A paper describes a structure:
The bacterial Makes caterpillars floppy 1 (Mcf1) toxin promotes apoptosis in insects, leading to loss of body turgor and death. The tail consists of two putative translocation and three putative receptor-binding domains.
To test the role of the C-terminal region of Mcf1 in the autoprocessing reaction, we purified a Mcf1 mutant devoid of 15 C-terminal amino acids (Δ15C) and incubated it with Arf3 in vitro. Strikingly, the autocleavage reaction proceeded several times faster than with the wild-type toxin and yielded the same fragments. To obtain a stable complex, we used the C1397A Δ15C variant of Mcf1 to make sure that the protease is inactive and the C-terminus does not interfere with the interaction (see above) and determined structures of the Mcf1 variant in the absence and presence of Arf3. During particle selection and 2D classification, we noticed in both datasets that the Mcf1 head domain was clearly visible, while the tail domain was absent in most 2D classes or blurry in others. This is in contrast to the single particle analysis of the wild type and suggests, that the removal of the last 15 amino acids destabilizes the neck regions leading to a high flexibility between the head and tail. Therefore, we only concentrated on the heads for the following analysis.
Numbering used by the authors: 4 to 909, 924 to 1591
Write the structure that this text describes.
């Protein structure tokens, strides 16, 4: 809370960053992350105070010998409290008191219950016994039976009744405990009495014993009283059941709420448990009680499902099980449920009482044979009867979803959240400081951490050490507690104080000692390449290396080599040495589980050997010793593990004898994924001792000059074991005993023993490359790779070598033994000499990148540099469908691959609410937002198809077109008629239309793409059919004739704005079509966007067919045009522009045009009044750029950042106030022009039936075939009768004249744009085009994105950003080639207006929009790059210069002055090229949308790069450039960034607006927040 504490944290943060070397756990944060970090700092400091210093207080106190006794627990605790009621208040003290108090309450309750139980037992024995005239004996008890059994029953009934009434009591109470104890005593004594009556003469004495044996020793409780102590509220126990994982897909056992009922996901679960631990293991050891065995806590670690359940149910079946005392139980008990079902109870733990394996089973419902089967539904219903429906909960569920989100990764931890989720967790143990040694050291409350190069240990604290540690740490924490509240005034840590500096010097080492550092706790969603992991390695490189290791590990590709290796290797005697390794014994333990039936059969053999041991010991002559007359556990266990090892190395073919009968089972096991992974993870461990056993000397075959010739500088480690990462992984509780201990060697210890030696040259080299570091250059990999020719017994092919060597590198990364680099370096040093060897290059490439990394962030360039050289050697034999490809490195975290195995088989499902929508479409449309986006990003929708909804959010559904039949109603789909989307260009003469029956039978709905600046017009074509037109012009309803229904822009326009958005569709209802309009908007909702129904007006409105609609609109349009001319006259007067002579020129002649003389006065007036504000705002635009240039380059972001916000607010006022006016003036002018053209020349001049009568704004515009095709496949103009869909569905059977499979994609695109073929032929040719196109894009570009990065690098580039291969503007058609033409037009605005920061922001936007393809922003972006394919405003921003050879283009750039940009718009594709010259010299840029954007300092370098790229690798021929193969010719188009920036892309966004440093939800927020608010 205190500002002073916040300033202190900011001070040490900034200072600790400034002190950083490379490789540090601090890094610079976002100014939002800053706050999340500080929040977690404060929270975890409070956790320390309550949960470790408090327990230390409980040992500085209690040092004096109070009365202590294991029996007088209550009294011991009571006096420990009265010892300390005098102690001053302090959070560690308060937490200690409160813990001791709650334990006092529990022990008091238990002691009360046990007392009243015993008194009741004695009372009932007196009641059942004879009068004092006789001794208590079985005879008199038998004589009493007929009366006093009924008396016992009567009392039991009375007690049960009274207790059931008392269960209405709101909390545990003396009466409740009393009655419960009485009931248990009566029940148990009744049972024992009846057993005595049933006891035989031989049992009678034992049953009388069991009656006289009162549990008065109190050595264990009555079971039901233990359950009483487990009750969470009187009459209820908390049940829980623990998941393997949250089972969203059914892979795991689960128990979850579904429709208010609780539901077990599977028919029985081994993982139930009851109750909850009374205290943490820390307190458990502080009381020095027995801790609960770890087999309760070990088996799972993910969120847990729990509810309160009625104690009677628990005590009926499960008290038979739940006793902690060793009552005889087998593996199982089967319990008859009253419905005739079984419940099976399973001894899933042989020691712990309160965790249970449970199964319900019974006669299979509705079956021909009475087989009993398990029944999850029966268990669910029985629980729902016995459960409370209230206070079901899942423990930690939000914590999981806010830190892991899902089962995150197949590799080691990266931050403490992933550590704490991992299987190694048990409980968060903070360490604290023991500073009274000469230098500071780390201690637990129980012990100080002894550390050694080999070993880490604790010596338990003697009293003087506890007094030191407590008094010091408490003195520090008291200061911290003061600073949060009394501030600097209280704490006296004034800015000049030496005490302040000492204090900070202590806090910083506290925050390092515990990994509360930023790299420890932030765990972001998408990792900026700045961020660093818990060891200070670069975060993104670690994530990528983990995803690489996983992908290599999962492929089935290398297995024929590795298992050949294993089959040979197993014959060496040294392999036995592998088994006594400590780490191998982690995982062969899992093999004992996987092969359990065989392993059991083996052990049943092995236990025979004991009999031969004892026999041999007796056969020895006159044995003076039981020489081996013993069961040697270690002998059998060794022999068994050795057998399991051999059966894992050599295949199941090794099975022999009777076990061949089980061999089909073993074969089925070992080929599982879990089988293969274990079967090789034991192999690589087995490899090391064998390699060592040859002792062949080191002899690398490739020399390297930079790092010492002839040797390697292996290992390169400093041993500096981290104590926190050790103790926060499960050591044995022997550490917790308050006794000195040596900690286990878990596998992670290999991850935690080592730290880089900054003095060594190899470290200096690696720190120049800035690889991750883990344990240095792998001398192990040297020792292995030196002898491969002897392990395999012959030379490897470079293919076989690189296969083995990549699998080994994956094994090393997977187990956390080394980095990628730490292995591949020695591989490249050891790669065999040979015609295809590649290590020489790889070394030179490392050196080349070293001399860079000392200066620049390599951002993964190294990994691509390696994979470019390895992959074509690995994949050398394979088909393109079967090649291996690793995940691809990116600025965002590593994304999945796009080729080969990773895709092979590795649509949205839709929701049945479609039937509700069908049932009441009006109510549905009133209550849910129906969006249409997928009806925009599909072109060429059929005339007839299946329509379905998909749910996306709360009341939010999307339509999709689909091919699935409605006769699978599970498709959630119905017959409907679609209408294609028409384009946004106001020059369009050819609207989209389709014809549908009056009195339809075939289908009852019609859908269209989202309306944004267009009209839906319904007209009556004849007696029986409507023609429905989607026209892309505003106000189009005025232009057609015989209009019977229409929705124009004005009907859904937000008044006083350019903004509008609406879904429109048609429905056949009450025997007539109804035009249904659902007005929408985009709205901001917590740094995201969503659609919603518009709430400021009726979201739905409806027209039946009408006649007067034309007149009704026309009057409105005339008035509105007059009114907007008033608006513009006003504003122009406000800026002093002369309106004289501005009026409509009488339309005399000619086609539609912008800047036609008739409107020229209005257009000029707009253009000028716009200039009067555009020049004005530019003065702030420059200032804003100056600001962003200082924001990127300074520490104190939040100082100046708000100024950005205020300048934005200022500008957006001007936009909101005047852009709307100018836009509306343009629209009303284009509309009046088109109306004049109709009025003079008739509708046939203003609507055309098809586009084949080629004409436009000029007689030809020489648009590339690529562009004119993409336009022809992202808008519908003309109808699409079924023939086109039939051709598309049959396109592999159909044949087309003058086409063959070896035509280029270009020559097909051309012939398709000839339009001469039938619709069935055009459908087939379209399909053939898309198939050929993506086959070529795969073969030419995705498979070679690696080498281009390196060509641009060593041609000399000075900045680069790869762009996502994956971002597509349409899921259908040619995905590859359609995005190029809009993207270059956006990018050139970005670059001209914001330089390298613009390019960064835009590529970030593309990345997010490809990672989350269905988030609101990624939809809006896709819907806003479309509408740049043919927007005539973009043609206003163009000038098609001639063809040029590349050299001339370069010379032209050299000739340019000031910023200038050019597209190349090659015949089938569009690179971009251009220059900026403002400062930092002249930088020349090049951009290929299939690869990335690159920059250069000099035109010589630029041409040297661009030639290599376009001709050196022949891509100019794949892009179909003009003229000769050598010296290709390109068009070029001198884009005017002054005008291109301002083209409308719908929803009121200028392209600049999508092209900006903020997120779209920011800009839209600012608009709503300054327009509608204020």
């Amino acid at each position: 809370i205190s500002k002073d504490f916040t300033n202190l944290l900011n001070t040490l943060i900034d200072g600790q960053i400034g002190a950083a070397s490379r490789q540090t756990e601090w890094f610079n944060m976002s100014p939002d992350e800053r706050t999340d970090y500080i929040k977690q700092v404060d929270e975890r400091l409070q956790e320390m105070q309550q949960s470790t210093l408090s327990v230390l207080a409980a040992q500085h106190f209690q040092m004096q010998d109070n009365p202590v006794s294991v029996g007088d627990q209550l009294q011991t605790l009571q006096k420990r409290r009265q010892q300390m009621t005098d102690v001053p208040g302090t959070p560690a003290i308060n937490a200690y008191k409160q813990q001791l108090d709650r334990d006092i309450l529990l022990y008091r309750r238990q002691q009360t219950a046990m007392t009243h139980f015993d008194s009741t037992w004695r009372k009932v024995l007196v009641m059942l016994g004879p009068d004092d005239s006789k001794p208590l004996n079985a005879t008199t008890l038998r004589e009493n039976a007929v009366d006093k059994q009924a008396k016992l029953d009567t009392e039991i009934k009375r007690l049960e009744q009274q207790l059931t009434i008392q269960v209405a009591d709101s909390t545990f109470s003396q009466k409740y405990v009393t009655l419960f104890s009485e009931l248990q005593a009566y029940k148990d004594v009744n049972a024992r009495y009846n057993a005595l009556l049933k006891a035989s003469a031989t049992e009678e004495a034992a049953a009388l014993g069991a009656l006289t044996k009162v549990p008065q020793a109190s050595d264990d409780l009555p079971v039901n009283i233990s359950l009483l102590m487990m009750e969470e509220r009187p009459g209820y126990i908390r049940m829980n059941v623990a998941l393997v994982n949250a089972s969203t897909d059914g892979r795991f056992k689960d128990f979850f709420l579904e429709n208010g009922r609780l539901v077990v996901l599977t028919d029985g679960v081994l993982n139930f448990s009851f109750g909850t631990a009374a205290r943490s293991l820390a307190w458990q050891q502080q009381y020095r009680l027995k801790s609960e065995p770890p087999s309760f806590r070990s088996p799972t670690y993910t969120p847990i499902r729990s509810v309160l359940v009625k104690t009677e149910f628990v005590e009926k079946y499960f008290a038979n099980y739940l006793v902690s005392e060793s009552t005889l139980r087998g593996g199982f008990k089967a319990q008859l449920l009253g419905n005739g079902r079984k419940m099976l109870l399973t001894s899933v733990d042989r020691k712990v009482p309160n965790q249970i394996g449970i199964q319900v089973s019974g006669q299979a419902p509705n079956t021909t044979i009475t087989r009993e089967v398990p029944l999850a539904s029966a268990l669910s219903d029985l629980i729902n009867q016995n459960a409370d429906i209230a206070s079901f909960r899942t423990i930690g569920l939000e914590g999981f979803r806010q830190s892991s989100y899902h089962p995150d990764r197949d590799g080691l931890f990266v931050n403490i959240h992933e550590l704490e989720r991992s299987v190694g967790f048990a409980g968060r143990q903070y360490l604290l400081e023991m500073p009274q040694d000469n230098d500071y050291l780390s201690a637990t409350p129980f012990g100080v951490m002894s550390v050694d190069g080999d070993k880490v240990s604790s010596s338990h604290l003697s009293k003087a050490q506890t007094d030191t540690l407590y008094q010091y740490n408490a003195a520090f924490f008291e200061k911290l507690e003061q600073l949060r509240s009394g501030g600097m005034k209280a704490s006296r840590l004034f800015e000049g104080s030496i005490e302040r500096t000492a204090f900070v010097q202590q806090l910083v080492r506290l925050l390092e000692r515990n990994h509360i550092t930023p790299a420890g706790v932030l765990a972001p969603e998408y990792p900026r390449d700045n961020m660093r992991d818990i060891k200070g390695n670069n975060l993104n490189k670690v994530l990528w290396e983990q995803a690489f290791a996983a992908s290599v590990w999962r492929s089935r590709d290398n297995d024929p080599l590795l298992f050949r290796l294993a089959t040979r290797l197993v014959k060496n005697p040294a392999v036995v040495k592998v088994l006594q390794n400590g780490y191998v014994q982690s995982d062969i333990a899992q093999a004992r589980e996987l092969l359990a039936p065989l392993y059991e059969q083996w052990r049943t053999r092995a236990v025979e050997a004991e009999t031969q041991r004892v026999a041999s010991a007796n056969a020895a002559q006159h044995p003076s010793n039981p020489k081996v007359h013993v069961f040697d556990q270690a002998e059998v266990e060794r022999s068994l593990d050795d057998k399991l090892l051999i059966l894992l190395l050599t295949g199941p073919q090794s099975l022999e004898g009777t076990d061949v009968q089980l061999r089909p089972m073993v074969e089925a096991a070992l080929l599982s994924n879990e089988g293969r992974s274990l079967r090789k993870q034991i192999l690589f461990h087995a490899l090391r001792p064998v390699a060592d056993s040859f002792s062949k000397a080191a002899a690398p075959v490739n020399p390297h000059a930079e790092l010492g010739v002839g040797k390697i500088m292996i290992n390169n480690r400093l041993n500096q074991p981290d104590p926190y990462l050790i103790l926060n992984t499960s050591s044995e509780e022997q550490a917790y005993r308050d006794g000195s201990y040596l900690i286990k060697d878990d596998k992670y210890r290999s991850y935690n023993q080592f730290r880089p030696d900054f003095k060594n040259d190899a470290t200096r080299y690696m720190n120049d490359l800035d690889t991750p570091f883990v344990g240095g250059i792998s001398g192990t990999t040297q020792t292995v790779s030196n002898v491969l020719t002897e392990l395999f017994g012959g030379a490897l092919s470079v293919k076989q070598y690189w296969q083995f060597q990549m699998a080994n590198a994956a094994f090393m990364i997977r187990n956390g033994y080394h980095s990628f680099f730490e292995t591949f370096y020695v591989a490249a040093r050891y790669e065999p000499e040979g015609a295809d060897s590649i290590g020489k290059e790889m070394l030179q490439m490392f050196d080349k990148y070293r001399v860079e990394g000392s200066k620049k962030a390599l951002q993964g360039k190294l990994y691509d540099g390696v994979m470019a050289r390895v992959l074509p050697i690995i994949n050398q034999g394979l088909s393109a469908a079967d090649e291996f490809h690793p995940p691809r490195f990116t600025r965002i975290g590593p994304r999945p691959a796009l080729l080969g195995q990773a895709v092979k088989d590795l649509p949205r499902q839709g929701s049945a609410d479609i039937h509700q929508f069908v049932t009441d479409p009006v109510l549905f449309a009133k209550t849910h937002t129906v969006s249409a986006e997928a009806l925009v990003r599909s072109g060429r929708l059929p005339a007839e198809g299946s329509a379905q909804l998909v749910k996306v959010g709360s009341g939010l559904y999307e339509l999709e077109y689909t091919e699935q039949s409605a006769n699978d109603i599970s498709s959630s789909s119905i017959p409907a008629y679609f209408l294609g989307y028409n384009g946004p260009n106001q020059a369009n003469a050819v609207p989209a239309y389709v014809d549908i029956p009056k009195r339809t039978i075939a289908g009852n709905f019609l859908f269209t793409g989202t309306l944004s600046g267009g009209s839906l017009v319904v007209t009556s074509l004849d007696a029986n059919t409507f023609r429905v037109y989607h026209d892309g012009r505003v106000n189009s309803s005025l232009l057609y004739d015989n209009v019977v229904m229409a929705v124009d822009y004005k009907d859904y326009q937000i008044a006083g704005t350019a903004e509008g958005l609406a879904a429109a569709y048609m429905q056949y209802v009450n025997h007539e079509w109804q035009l249904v309009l659902q007005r929408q908007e985009y709205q901001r909702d917590g740094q995201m966007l969503r659609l919603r129904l518009r709430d400021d007006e009726e979201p739905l409105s409806i027209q039946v067919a009408d006649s007067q609609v034309v007149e009704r609109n026309q009057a409105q349009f005339v008035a509105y045009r007059e009114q907007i001319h008033q608006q513009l006259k006003k504003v122009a007067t406000q800026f002093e522009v002369s309106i004289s002579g501005v009026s409509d020129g009488v339309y005399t002649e000619g086609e539609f045009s912008p800047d036609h003389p008739a409107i020229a006065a209005w257009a000029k007036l707009c253009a000028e009044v716009y200039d009067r504000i555009n020049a004005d705002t530019k003065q702030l635009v420059d200032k804003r750029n100056k600001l962003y240039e200082n924001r990127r380059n300074t520490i104190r972001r939040d100082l100046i950042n708000q100024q950005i916000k205020q300048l934005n607010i200022t500008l957006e006022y001007y936009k909101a106030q005047y852009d709307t006016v100018l836009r509306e003036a343009g629209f009303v002018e284009q509309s009046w022009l088109w109306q004049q053209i109709k009025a003079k020349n008739g509708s046939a001049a203003v609507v055309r039936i098809d586009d084949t009568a080629i004409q436009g704004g000029g007689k030809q515009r020489t648009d590339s075939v690529g562009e004119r095709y993409a336009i022809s496949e992202a808008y519908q103009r003309g109808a699409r009768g079924t023939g086109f869909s039939d051709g598309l569905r049959n396109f592999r059977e159909i044949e087309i004249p003058g086409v063959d499979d070896k035509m280029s994609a270009l020559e097909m695109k051309r012939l398709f744009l000839e339009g001469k073929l039938t619709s069935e032929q055009q459908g087939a040719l379209s399909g053939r085009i898309t198939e050929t196109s993506r086959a070529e894009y795969i073969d030419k570009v995705l498979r070679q994105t690696a080498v281009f990065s390196e060509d641009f690098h060593d041609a000399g580039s000075v900045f680069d950003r790869l762009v996502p291969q994956d971002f597509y503007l349409s899921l259908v058609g040619d995905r590859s080639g359609g995005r190029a033409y809009p993207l270059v037009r956006a990018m050139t605005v970005a670059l001209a207006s914001g330089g390298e920061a613009g390019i960064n922001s835009l590529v970030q936007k593309l990345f997010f929009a490809s990672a989350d393809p269905q988030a609101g922003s990624s939809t809006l972006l896709r819907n806003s790059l479309i509408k740049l394919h043919s927007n005539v405003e973009a043609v206003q921003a163009s000038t098609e210069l001639g063809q040029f050879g590349l050299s001339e283009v370069v010379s032209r750039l050299a000739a340019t002055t000031g910023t200038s940009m050019f597209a190349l718009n090659t015949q089938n594709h569009s690179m971009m090229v251009g220059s900026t010259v403002t400062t930092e010299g002249r930088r020349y840029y090049f951009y290929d949308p299939n690869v990335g954007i690159f920059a250069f300092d000099n035109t010589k370098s630029l041409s040297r790069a661009m030639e290599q790229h376009l001709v050196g690798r022949r891509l100019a021929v794949h892009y179909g450039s003009f003229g000769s193969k050598s010296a290709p010719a390109f068009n070029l188009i001198e884009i005017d960034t002054g005008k291109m920036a301002e083209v409308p892309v719908g929803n009121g966004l200028n392209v600049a607006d999508l092209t900006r440093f903020e997120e779209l939800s920011s800009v839209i927020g600012q608009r709503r927040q300054v327009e509608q608010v204020m």
